[PDB]
Amino acid sequence: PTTENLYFQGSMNIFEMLRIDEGLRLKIYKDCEGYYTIGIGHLLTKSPDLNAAKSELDKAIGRNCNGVITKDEAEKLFNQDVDAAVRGILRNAKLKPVYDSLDAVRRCAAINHVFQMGVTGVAGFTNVLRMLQQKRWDEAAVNLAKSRWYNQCPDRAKRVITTFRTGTWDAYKNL
Numbered sequence: 001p002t003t004e005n006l007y008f009q010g011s012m013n014i015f016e017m018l019r020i021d022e023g024l025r026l027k028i029y030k031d032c033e034g035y036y037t038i039g040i041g042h043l044l045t046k047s048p049d050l051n052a053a054k055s056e057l058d059k060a061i062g063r064n065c066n067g068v069i070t071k072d073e074a075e076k077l078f079n080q081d082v083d084a085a086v087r088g089i090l091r092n093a094k095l096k097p098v099y100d101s102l103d104a105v106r107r108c109a110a111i112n113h114v115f116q117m118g119v120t121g122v123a124g125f126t127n128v129l130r131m132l133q134q135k136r137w138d139e140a141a142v143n144l145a146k147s148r149w150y151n152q153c154p155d156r157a158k159r160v161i162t163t164f165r166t167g168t169w170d171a172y173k174n175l
């Protein structure tokens with residue numbers, strides 16, 4: 001690895017990771033599962049009603065947005081959502097021990113997974129959690145690749161799975 005290559009891991013963190021997996025959109029759009037989303041992976045509602053999405057948006061941002069936000073607002077909402085995912089892991093009796101056992105890079109993958117699926121969804125992956133705690137990385141990655149989360153929307157999940165396998169940031173290189 002070059003001097004520049006060795007600096008790459010210092011440029012990656014949970015924010016940069018999710019920013020790549022979720023993208024950045026300033027107008028309401030439907031994600032790969034058909035759910036109204038905005039910003040950096042902020043799911044507004046699972047309701048099919050765009051008015052519901054707009055109502056949630058205005059609530060979240062605090063002004064009359066009419067379905068559009070600024071980059072600064074996207075970033076603030078993103079930081080709030082990341083904090084929520086971390087807090088959700090740390091207070092959960094099943095996820096905290098697994099998270100604590102992980103290295104720094106896999107901890108980011110854990111937060112990313114919770115950001116995407118929510119706490120109960122992730123806490124339901126009983127086998128994967130045991131595999132991770134036992135450092136069975138290849139088995140964990142194969143099992144994640146069986147999930148509906150990954151299979152219904154592979155591009156948003158693939159990088160996370162690779163990161164659980166390797167504990168490096170390589171899947172986020174060379175976009």
Ligand SMILES: OCCn1cccn1
Nearest residue numbers: 089095098099110113
């Ligand atoms: O995403 C599976 C790993 N994980 C552990 C705690 C939260 N997530």
